[PDB]
Amino acid sequence: PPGPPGPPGDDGPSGAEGPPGPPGPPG
Amino acid sequence: PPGPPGPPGDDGPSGAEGPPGPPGPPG
């Protein structure tokens, strides 16, 4: 009689920080 | 025998908001 499956894995790491925004308005 | 490994974890959470974009064209 084999054991039950192990616990579900942890959630992965957080994704990277988002890319920079669009360029600002003209001065 | 031991049970098999558990189900794979979910994807991680979303990253933080990106930084501000480049400064606009000069006046």
Next chain:
Amino acid sequence: PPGPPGPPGDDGPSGAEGPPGPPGPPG
């Protein structure tokens, strides 16, 4: 005995794009 835990999940999605940059320098 129970199995090993599942592998940790994938890296999450990227954070949202940043806000628009600061306005350009003055003329």
